[PDB]
Design a binder for this molecule. Structure first.
Ligand code: MN
Ligand code: MN
Length: 363
């Protein structure tokens, strides 16, 4: 159980475009000794689902094996089961909703036999959150305390409910399986009540797969798509949500979008803003934009240039002693500066403040 001396801030990104979608993503190790986050991003799906897309963030615990496996294989376990292909024509809401349940339980069990057969030593587990997007529906999927949300019409239209042990239904299940919730943890150890893997928590004799201490059962929500009102979707692991709320991040992402159409950069900003707000976990963000996502605005760009220039002068004028960056940040915060990005605050502006500090105090 360890942190690094200094955070690994190297971004891993991806992007793509298709089916009237644009997407960006950013993943960062941060203060943690390991990177155990994984993700999927694919526009255009096999077997006659060309117009479908799928995205997901996977937050691994006690190693990355479960996450990494899910990130390569969860999609086919979901679409290649009889429940997903039940009816004859294109799959229905129930086909999709059940297909995901079956796909989740079947990959979990599949990993359990692989781990048994090969004598595997890892005792890892993983959250999953994502959307499966059809020409007319966004199907949110959640299993764990990773979280996604839909921004529609400038507002938080929907978000996923984190599976926490102390949530009433999860508490009920955990107790009926002969465990308890201590403070916020399953038997005082595990911070999530749902996850793939974690097989040591799925050994309760004579209880179903979905009635163990930790369930792999997903929660699925069908939201009907809205060409006119749908703006963007954020998926991210708990490393983000720990330090930003739904509305905030939603307002922040908007404010960034009005400045770039570069989505990897928007995801970098979210991730950095969070590290600077105190987050010490691995972080991974996916941003998927619909055609009526916020547009780059000339005025917004100008306002950011003006703010940036202002922040640069404030840094120099403060330097006059020679205070360190931590102290300059302190002074700047005490100045109560207007027009900082919404949700992001001073933290979302540290990269500008620090490059300036470095220009003026390089040694
Ligand atoms: Mn993790
Ligand atoms: Mn995490």
């Amino acid at each position: 159980g360890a942190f690094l001396d200094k955070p690994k801030m190297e971004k891993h990104n991806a992007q793509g475009q298709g089916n009237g979608l644009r997407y960006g993503l950013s993943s960062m190790q941060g203060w943690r000794v390991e990177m155990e986050d994984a993700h999927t991003a694919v526009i255009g799906l096999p077997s006659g689902l060309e117009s479908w897309s799928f995205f997901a963030v996977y937050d691994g615990h006690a190693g990355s094996q479960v996450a990494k496996y899910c990130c390569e294989h969860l999609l086919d376990h979901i679409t290649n089961n009889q429940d997903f292909k039940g009816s004859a024509g294109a799959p229905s809401v129930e086909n999709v909703k059940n297909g995901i349940r079956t796909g989740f339980l079947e990959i979990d069990e599949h990993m359990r036999v692989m781990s048994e057969k090969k004598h595997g030593a890892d005792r890892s587990g993983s959250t999953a959150v994502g959307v499966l997007i059809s020409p007319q529906h966004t199907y949110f999927i959640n299993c764990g305390d990773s979280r996604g949300l839909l921004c529609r019409n400038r507002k938080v239209h929907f978000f996923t409910q984190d599976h926490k042990p102390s949530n009433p239904l999860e508490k009920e299940r955990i107790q009926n399986a002969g465990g308890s919730v201590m403070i916020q943890r399953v038997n005082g150890s595990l911070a999530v009540s749902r996850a793939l893997g974690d097989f040591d928590y799925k050994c309760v004799h004579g209880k179903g797969p979905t009635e163990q201490l930790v369930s792999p059962e997903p929660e699925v929500h069908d939201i009907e798509r809205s060409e006119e009102d749908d703006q963007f979707i954020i998926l991210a692991c708990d490393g983000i949500w720990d330090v930003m709320g739904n509305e905030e991040l939603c307002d922040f992402v908007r404010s960034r979008l009005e400045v770039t159409d570069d989505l990897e950069k928007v995801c970098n900003e979210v991730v950095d803003t969070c590290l600077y707000k105190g987050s010490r976990d691995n972080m991974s963000v996916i941003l998927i934009c619909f055609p009526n996502a916020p547009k780059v605005s000339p005025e917004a760009v100008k306002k950011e240039a003006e703010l940036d220039k202002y922040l640069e002068c404030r840094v120099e004028e403060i330097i006059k002693g020679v205070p360190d960056l931590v102290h300059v940040m302190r002074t700047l915060a005490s100045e109560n500066i207007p027009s900082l990005p919404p949700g992001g605050e001073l933290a979302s502006k540290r990269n500008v403040i620090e490059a300036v500090y470095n220009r003026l105090n390089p040694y």
